[PDB]
Enzyme design. Structure first.
Site, PDB file in Angstrom:
ATOM      1  N   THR A   1       0.690  -1.346   0.000  1.00 25.46           N
ATOM      2  CA  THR A   1       0.000   0.000   0.000  1.00 25.46           C
ATOM      3  C   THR A   1       0.708   1.381   0.000  1.00 25.46           C
ATOM      4  O   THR A   1       1.798   1.542   0.545  1.00 25.46           O
ATOM      5  CB  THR A   1      -0.917  -0.045   1.213  1.00 25.46           C
ATOM      6  OG1 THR A   1      -1.685  -1.233   1.092  1.00 25.46           O
ATOM      7  CG2 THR A   1      -1.908   1.116   1.277  1.00 25.46           C
ATOM      8  N   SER A   2       0.056   2.348  -0.651  1.00 27.35           N
ATOM      9  CA  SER A   2       0.288   3.779  -0.424  1.00 27.35           C
ATOM     10  C   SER A   2      -1.034   4.458  -0.035  1.00 27.35           C
ATOM     11  O   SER A   2      -2.012   4.389  -0.784  1.00 27.35           O
ATOM     12  CB  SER A   2       0.847   4.455  -1.678  1.00 27.35           C
ATOM     13  OG  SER A   2       1.853   3.670  -2.279  1.00 27.35           O
TER      14      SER A   2
END
Ligand SMILES: [Mg+2]
Ligand SMILES: [Mg+2]
Ligand SMILES: [Mg+2]
Lengths: 196, 222, 125, 204, 195, 212, 222, 222, 196, 195
Positions: free
Chosen positions: A1-2
């Site tokens: 994730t970001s």
């Protein structure tokens, strides 16, 4: 994730990519990492999909029961419930959560909760594996009291870069706008954000 | 069994003629990433005690809540809560020391090193240390982490034994503390330039200084 | 759990439940013990309002607690089985830890202790 | 399986007024089993004395090696090696086996025949020279020997008084170590006479 | 512990069990009896972990003796063996299992037949004409496969047993200090003193 | 440690050393390794000092409670089994004990039981326990007869500990002697190895391996 | 060990403590950690004691041969180059940590070397277990354009910090001053602030106290 | 993985006379190579003329002393203010220690006082509760340095009467309090010289029928 | 470390912080990580101090011997020698090196050599632990054919951010300018760059 | 391998060595001679790792026999023992060390004295009045400390040796199948056939 969340003049906006991972295989390229725990209190999820989901489900249950008895909970209250779960079960959890909500008294607020279960109130927050690559960019470009259009561009440009460098990030950029006006969902596809 | 995630570095302190000084920088590190910059690691309890904490920040925030709760609980059914039966530094310490040793004995420690600085009701200076192992000790100067290795030697040049305490003024003491903080910024890879400093004096009381910066640095010499 | 104190003192200093338990004993068939110079004999009455009995299988009045000690009784038959069972278990437990069978005094002291415990425990008669 | 504490043993050296003393125990064992009560750990090459503690096979080997080397020294140099020079030879020889060392704790003792100065020195297994005015200790009861020497020792003791001090240092140290003892030997060394005494000590 | 054997013949069951108790490099005892009488016509030998063996044997002994007194009756060898198996089958999934292997020799008075049961610490039961636990079996089973006949007398069984002990004393690494031999038949349990 | 106890014509001899060690460090030379449970019962200690000391004095309290409850001194068999059943409950937890319960009663006569921390319980005439047990066995076995006099038996026990004290690095200090008769135990003194070795060497002519 | 090096006006000064340990035991209370590579190039060494001595002697030997070969006074950078390539070749297995200093035709120089083979440069340096106590003092009191007597004071003060605050360091202060145009001046036991106090009692025994079994004259002659 | 134990260094020493007993201990407290405090006492008056020290891991040491002090308090409450004799205190401490047999107090415990005949008494414990009365005992980091010196000077071990052919031993005799304090001071100065964890200060507690007296002496601070 | 090299109109500029680390202790706060292997061919060093020093020393020796025989070596040639050492001794090395030089024919050139010993020619390169935090910033701000002043500002701002987030980076910002005009050394102190 | 003993008396050296060769749970042989004659008045017994023992013994034997032929002279027991020690001292720092322990019994004809040397696999040499390798020493040393006198005859030495074997046969865990005894004196080496 970001993932990230950013406060601005009219409230707060949350942002996230859509990539879910099992090693180098993308298990889901259209994931929704922005989750509703209350009408105008949302969270960004990073870390284990199973852990963050189980936490968000428990929080949503707690705030629904809070609302039944004491009315609308503050964003701080929501963050405290996340913290309590993350801190007390730190040995068995892999969850990095950003909490963001809109009050009318307090306007936009952002709380970030890292692995240990500590709480940190900030003007904006970034998290997830891809966040490492945009600390420099975000610090240089963030201003307080931005407009809606400016904040959307800030998040769009930021996550674009995080996605570009992080293999664990990609797909679409989802956003959720939290203001007095209501709740707005935005989506931005590769063909737009890649060539920024 | 734990591992620390978000961490705080050195806490440094010393006694002077009328009271005690304590300091700690405003950084919350995430491994090598210098992640959080608005972190206050000195927490006042009443107007006569400051608790300085290093180590895991989630555990620090837990200890904050415990101390906050201790003030509330002490005020219950206590007409002298702001007088003779106010919380002493020695009470606050012994409580924390008990908790730290109990947690280590349950193999689930609070991953911290703690310094309690204050002034007792009779005017006596209080300065004592406790950590994740429950180990306690007292000295004219006390410091945690890197501070123990770099600050203590500097602060011990001012107050080397008990008899040096009456001979040391608040101006001289604060100067030594501020200097030590600069040295830590030069040499500790997990220090920040910004820090907080607290003085607890038996006459002037608690003075809490925020947003201090390390200045007058020597680099011009590569 | 059922807690009621069933065995309690009365104004005159008697525990009626214990004394009424003695009346049950008085109702039971007669049992006698006589010891000689080199033996002990246990005699027991069996009421004859019961014809068509099968004496092969009907519970005997004198029970072996171990190979060297016996126990007869008067009173409630169902109650006696509980005391006999407990005694037989203690007999084997004694052999196990002390490496010697029980003395008759010890076995008696145990059975009596069980009986006493049921006079100041809640929820039991 | 720690090479320096399989066999056991101790050595100690002291300086006095125009004299030196070097002493050692007699035990050789295999961990708990005592095997020999005649195993001396002090050797000499001319007037230079060397004591060696540690793994006994290496004690024997190094003695044989330094006898070898000092014999060739004397043939070429046409004089006996001095304590200062022999100390350097021991250091060189040990460091030559830097990454495969002899598991030993050697101690040099003697009087320089030219200057008359008393000299003692100690080494780690890898060659580091430890020079001292007062005393050098070695072996499985080195902690004990350090404590005994530091308290009992005073400078400029006469040979007869120095004997009492070094003997009492060794004996009381050995009795607090399971792997040391089983007899003891003391060497009193003057400029041109050396007296060797066997001590009566407890045999457990 | 170590060596325990059993042979079932025409009219009896014969159990042989080593006398040695060794701990470290010392034989602490050379006259140890590795057996308990469970009932007048049932004998159990045992081998395994120190402490566990006697503790288990005596625990079983107490239970069978308790049964005998309660019912005024002797359990069949088959019934006793099944009780013992179940106790070991429970034990193997406990926090700390009994590490004990047993042989049960009994004479069934209702069937007028000798019976020999082999049970290991897992609770693995089998009825056999001859049995062994531990390394002993690696020699004795093949030996008995050859020399054993089902119609042998008690005397023939003892000679067959001497042949096993001789082989073990020749080829086994450890000194087990001979065996105590006991016979189980219609008249109960008795010990052979000169073996 | 080295400890022994053997049975003979004139009762039981019990002999022990007095050394305590922490690795190679000699912690003490004056330890009491025999515990006097009652006038007719003795316990020997080998293994973990605290384990032995704590649980054997505890055993003494259990034996006292027996004679209060039963109006009769406890048997050697029953006393030993209390200890063995206790340590069996702790089996695996890491207790370290090698003990011998020695005593006289009317029904048993002179009796010795070996009890250790993995639950082994053995009746016997001769046992040696501890790190130096083998050294004691060597001397004891090669001089043991049933018909030894009280004087000779006392010496053999003393001499067997001395043998082990000398050879075993983790044994030493002094020898403590006890004699158990039908009338109870009798203490026969503390004998420092420092003097005893040289006295035995001179008078007996043994220990020729040592420099005289 | 505590060792330092400080540059000044017309040269460089190095200093060290004099404690040698084997574990927590003090083996030598006055060992010499200041080594000579050439007359005007000196080394201070921490780490494995035999390695520092052996590597300093080997390079010192090769430097002498090089000086004789080239008919030139040896340079500090040559000793630096030779030490670093030797230590790198052995991948840190030779545990020598050195401060190299001296004067030569090129000028005055101050370097440090780590066991794996990295060199450093500085106006002030410190190595060893007491390096953090020493560096704290150096960072506090160092300035550009030091005099000779100022640099000696600073260097010995930095060593004292180690002596008092580090358990690995103790006893005395050795100093060596290397000035341009002058002979290097070695100051053994420049400071002795750790003299043993008078003992309470003499432990001289009455003659005859020790029991003896055998006497014999030992033949040392041919 | 979290390690619940630590080592705070220091050393202690107990000697018994005819009508008195001393329990001494240095005042230095350490972790690794750092000094935490130059004056942190670890010998305590526990009431009833019993002095106690639990040296090793200070958190466990303080916990034990705290529990025993509390045990003395409750002994008075439960047994009509009866004085706790030294032999009874010893047995009580065994149970405190063995109670944590499977998670031990990492300490070496010594207590001192007078027995019920008025004679001096010293008892020493292992970490899990094994105990023994002695004339003499050293404990802690430098126990292995001091103890053999005590065997020689208090119990006259290896000392024979001069001229008696090593046949007659030096007779045992009680030492005066002046003589005992001389041995204590020499023992601690010797230990300070050769052990890095020992120094700073020496505090002796002397126990007679009149009460508990204190004496303090400086020790080397390096 | 944080290190970088950037090509521009007149040539190429190298940049680096001055921190040397041994755990969390700063062994040297005034380190020079920019190393000369030839008159106008320099390198930035990251990874092991001992390994990178030994490599740079060997390269400098090789190029000095090259120059003696064949005249000035190309920047590509210098990179090839670095590669050969890094690739063939990959099992025993921890060295991330950026090579940068100025030719008159080829102008400014930058080659980056990561852990494995591969070579990559780029317009600009970033490396060291602190580089992770400025991938986003540098990609967004780098332009080709910048001026000297613009390139100095780009490096100053970039390393400022890398230093701000990376604990393994800090001290001064050193730079080395490589043009036809010559070799210029620049230094920038905390008081300037921290408040950018 | 396992048990090797040695006793030096007034006029001779006596070596006793166990006859068993065990591999796994099988005693493969019960008549094994664990000794080699190095020279007419020097005998070496050995125990340790399988293969290594005989390989080392025969290698030493070859070297001493080579020396004897070259110089037409018999090396002293002291000289042979020093040669053997050095070979083992080399071996211990080799890629694969010889795991062999030896006793060397010899009669020095120049001194007219028996000599017994004990050397372990590390190369640790000692001259002794009596010696043992492995677990044997834990029983025999204390026994010999008591019963040994330096002026004993060969017959007295054999009785003293019987006392050692008896003790080992009583207290040792393994069956070592008795010993082969050999005497080294002024007249050379001879074997006692009835032991
Ligand atoms: Mg991507
Ligand atoms: Mg011994
Ligand atoms: Mg210090």
């Amino acid at each position: 994730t970001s993932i990230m969340a950013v406060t601005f003049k009219d409230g707060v906006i949350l942002g996230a990519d859509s990539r879910t991972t099992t090693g180098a295989y993308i298990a889901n390229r259209v994931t929704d990492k922005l989750t509703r725990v209350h009408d105008k209190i949302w969270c960004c999820r990073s870390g284990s999909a199973a852990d963050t989901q189980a936490i968000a489900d428990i929080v949503q249950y707690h705030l629904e029961l809070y609302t039944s008895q004491y009315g609308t909970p503050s964003t701080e209250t929501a963050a405290s419930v996340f913290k309590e779960l993350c801190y007390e079960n730190k040995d068995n959890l892999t969850a990095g959560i950003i909490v963001a909500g809109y009050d009318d008294k307090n306007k936009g607020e952002v709380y970030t909760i890292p692995l240990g279960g500590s709480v940190h109130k900030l003007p904006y927050a970034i998290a997830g594996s891809g966040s490492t690559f945009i600390y420099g960019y975000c610090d240089k470009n963030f201003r307080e009291n931005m407009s809606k259009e400016e904040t959307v561009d800030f998040i769009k440009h930021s996550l674009s870069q995080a996605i570009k460098w992080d293999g664990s990030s990609g797909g679409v950029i989802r956003m959720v706008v939290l203001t007095a006006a209501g709740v707005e969902r935005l989506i931005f596809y590769p063909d737009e954000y890649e060539q920024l | 069994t734990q591992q620390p995630i978000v961490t705080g570095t050195s806490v440094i302190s010393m006694k002077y003629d009328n009271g005690v000084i304590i300091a700690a920088d405003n950084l919350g590190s995430y491994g090598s990433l210098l992640r959080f910059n608005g972190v206050e690691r000195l927490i006042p309890v009443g107007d006569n005690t400051v608790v300085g904490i290093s180590g895991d920040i989630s555990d620090m925030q837990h200890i904050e809540r415990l101390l906050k709760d201790l003030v509330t609980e002490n005020a219950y059914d206590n007409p002298l809560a702001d007088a003779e039966e106010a919380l002493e530094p020695s009470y606050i310490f012994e409580y924390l020391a008990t908790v730290m040793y109990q947690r280590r004995s349950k193999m689930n420690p609070l991953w911290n090193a703690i310094i309690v600085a204050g002034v007792q009701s009779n005017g006596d200076q209080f300065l004592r240390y406790v950590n994740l192992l429950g180990v306690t000790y007292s000295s004219p100067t006390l410091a945690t982490g890197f501070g123990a290795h770099m600050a203590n030697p500097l602060l011990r040049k001012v107050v080397d034994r008990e008899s040096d305490i009456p001979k040391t003024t608040v101006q001289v003491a604060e100067e030594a503390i501020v200097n030590a903080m600069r040295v830590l910024y030069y040499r500790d890879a997990r220090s920040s330039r910004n820090f907080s400093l607290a003085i607890i004096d038996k006459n002037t009381g608690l003075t809490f200084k925020k947003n201090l910066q390390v200045e007058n640095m020597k680099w011009d010499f590569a | 759990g059922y807690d009621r104190a069933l065995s309690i003192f009365s104004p005159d200093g008697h525990i009626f439940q214990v004394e009424y338990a003695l009346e049950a004993v008085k109702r039971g068939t007669c049992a006698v013990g006589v010891k000689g110079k080199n033996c002990v004999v246990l005699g027991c009455e069996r009421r004859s309002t019961l014809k068509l009995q099968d004496t092969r299988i009907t519970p005997s009045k004198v029970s072996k607690i171990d190979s060297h000690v016996v126990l007869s009784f008067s009173g409630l038959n169902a109650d006696s089985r509980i005391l006999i069972e407990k005694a037989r278990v203690e007999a084997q437990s004694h052999r196990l830890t002390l490496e010697d069978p029980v003395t008759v005094e010890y076995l008696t002291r145990y059975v009596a202790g069980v009986q006493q415990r049921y006079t100041q425990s809640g929820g039991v008669r | 399986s720690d090479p320096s504490s399989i066999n056991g043993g101790i050595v100690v050296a002291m300086t006095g007024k125009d004299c030196v003393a070097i002493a050692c125990d007699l035990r050789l064992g295999s961990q708990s089993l005592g095997v020999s009560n005649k195993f001396e750990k002090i050797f000499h090459y001319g007037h230079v004395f060397l004591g060696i503690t540690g793994l006994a096979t290496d004690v024997t080997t190094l003695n044989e090696m330094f006898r070898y080397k000092t014999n060739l020294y004397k043939l070429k140099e046409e004089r006996a090696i001095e304590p200062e020079t022999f100390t350097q030879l021991v250091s060189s020889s040990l460091y030559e086996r830097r990454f495969g060392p002899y598991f030993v704790g050697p101690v040099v003792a003697g009087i320089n025949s030219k200057s008359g100065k008393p000299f003692i020195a100690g080494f780690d297994l890898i060659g580091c020279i430890d020079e001292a005015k007062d005393f050098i200790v070695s072996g499985t009861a080195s902690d004990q020997l350090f404590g005994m020497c530091e308290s009992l020792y005073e400078p400029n003791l006469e040979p007869e008084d120095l004997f009492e001090t070094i003997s009492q240092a060794l004996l009381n140290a050995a009795d607090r170590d399971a792997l040391s003892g089983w007899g003891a030997v003391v060497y009193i060394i003057k400029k041109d006479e050396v007296v060797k005494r066997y001590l009566k000590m407890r045999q457990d | 512990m170590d060596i325990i054997l059993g042979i079932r013949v025409q009219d009896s069951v014969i159990l042989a069990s080593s006398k040695a108790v060794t701990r470290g490099i010392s034989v602490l005892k050379d006259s140890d009896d590795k057996t308990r009488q469970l009932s007048p016509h049932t004998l159990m030998s045992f081998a395994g972990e120190a402490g566990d063996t006697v503790q288990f044997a005596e625990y079983i002994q107490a239970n069978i003796q308790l049964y005998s007194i309660r019912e005024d009756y002797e359990l069949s060898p088959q019934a006793v063996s099944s009780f013992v198996r179940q106790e070991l089958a429970k034990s193997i999934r406990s926090r700390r299992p009994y590490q004990v292997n047993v042989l049960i020799g009994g004479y069934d008075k209702k069937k007028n037949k000798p019976e020999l049961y082999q049970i290991d610490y897992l609770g693995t039961k089998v009825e056999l004409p001859y049995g062994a636990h531990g390394y002993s079996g690696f020699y004795t089973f093949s030996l008995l496969d050859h020399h054993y006949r089902p119609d042998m007398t008690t005397e023939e069984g003892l000679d067959l047993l001497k042949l096993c002990v001789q082989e073990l004393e020749k080829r086994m690494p450890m000194d087990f200090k001979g065996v105590i031999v006991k016979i189980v038949d219609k008249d109960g349990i008795r010990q052979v003193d000169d073996f | 440690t080295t400890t022994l106890a053997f049975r003979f014509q004139g009762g039981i001899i019990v002999a022990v050393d007095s050394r305590a060690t922490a690795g190679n460090w000699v912690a003490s030379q004056t330890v009491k390794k025999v515990i006097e449970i009652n006038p007719f019962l003795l316990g020997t200690m080998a293994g973990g000092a605290a384990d032995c000391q704590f649980w054997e004095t505890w055993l003494g309290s259990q034996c006292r409670l027996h004679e209060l409850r039963e109006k009769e001194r406890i048997s050697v068999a029953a006393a030993s089994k209390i200890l063995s059943n206790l340590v069996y409950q702790y089996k695996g937890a890491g207790l370290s004990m090698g003990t011998m319960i020695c005593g006289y009663t009317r029904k048993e006569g002179p009796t010795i039981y070996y009890v250790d921390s993995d639950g082994t319980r053995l009746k016997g005439d001769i046992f040696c326990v501890g790190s130096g047990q083998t050294f004691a066995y060597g001397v004891l076995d090669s001089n043991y007869k049933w018909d030894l006099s009280v004087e000779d038996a006392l010496y053999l026990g003393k001499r067997s500990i001395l043998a082990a004290a000398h050879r075993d690095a983790y044994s030493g200090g002094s020898v403590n002697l006890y004699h158990v008769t039908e009338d109870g135990w009798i203490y026969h003194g503390n004998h420092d190895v420092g003097e005893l070795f040289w006295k035995v060497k001179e008078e007996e002519g043994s220990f020729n391996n040592v420099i005289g | 060990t505590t060792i330092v090096g400080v540059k000044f006006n017309n040269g460089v000064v190095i200093a060290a403590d004099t404690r040698s340990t084997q574990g927590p035991i003090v083996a030598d209370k006055n060992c010499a950690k200041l080594h000579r590579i050439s007359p005007k190039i000196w080394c201070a060494g921490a780490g494995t004691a035999a390695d520092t001595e052996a590597v300093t002697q080997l390079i010192g030997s090769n430097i002498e041969l090089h000086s004789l070969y080239t008919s030139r006074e040896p340079r500090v950078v040559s000793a630096l180059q030779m030490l670093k390539q030797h230590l790198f070749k052995y991948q840190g297995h030779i545990g020598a940590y050195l401060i190299v200093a001296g004067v030569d035709p090129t000028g005055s120089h101050l370097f440090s070397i780590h066991a794996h083979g990295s060199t450093d440069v500085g106006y002030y340096l410190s190595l060893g277990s007491g390096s953090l106590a020493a560096m704290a003092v150096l960072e506090s009191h160092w300035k550009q354009d030091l005099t000779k007597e100022e640099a000696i004071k600073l260097a010995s003060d930095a060593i004292q910090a180690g002596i008092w605050n580090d358990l690995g360091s103790g006893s005395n202060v050795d100093v060596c001053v290397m000035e341009i145009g002058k002979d290097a001046e070695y100051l053994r036991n420049y400071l002795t602030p750790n003299v043993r106090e008078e003992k309470q009692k003499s432990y001289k025994f009455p003659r005859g106290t020790t029991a003896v079994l055998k006497e014999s004259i030992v033949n040392i002659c041919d | 993985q979290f390690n619940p134990y630590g080592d705070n260094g220091g050393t202690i020493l107990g000697i018994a006379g005819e009508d008195f007993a001393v329990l001494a201990g240095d005042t230095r407290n350490i972790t690794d190579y750092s000094i935490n405090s130059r004056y942190e006492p670890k010998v305590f008056d526990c009431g009833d003329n019993i002095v106690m020290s639990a040296n090793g891991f200070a958190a466990d040491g303080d916990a034990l002393v705290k529990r025993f002090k509390n045990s003395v308090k409750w002994y008075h409450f439960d047994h009509n203010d009866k004085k706790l004799s030294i032999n009874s205190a010893a047995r009580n401490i065994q149970h405190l220690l063995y109670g944590k047999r499977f998670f031990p107090y990492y300490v070496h415990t010594i207590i001192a006082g007078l027995d019920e005949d008025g004679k001096g008494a010293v008892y020493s414990f292992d970490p899990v509760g094994s105990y023994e009365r002695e004339q003499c005992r050293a404990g802690g980091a430098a126990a292995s340095l001091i103890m053999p010196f005590l065997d020689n000077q208090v119990n006259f071990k290896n000392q024979y009467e001069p001229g008696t052919n090593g046949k007659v031993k030096k007779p045992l005799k009680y030492l005066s309090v002046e003589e005992v304090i001389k041995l204590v001071r020499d023992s601690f100065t010797s230990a300070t010289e050769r052990h890095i964890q020992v120094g700073d200060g020496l505090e002796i507690l002397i126990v007679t029928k009149d009460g508990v007296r204190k004496e303090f002496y400086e020790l080397k601070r390096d």
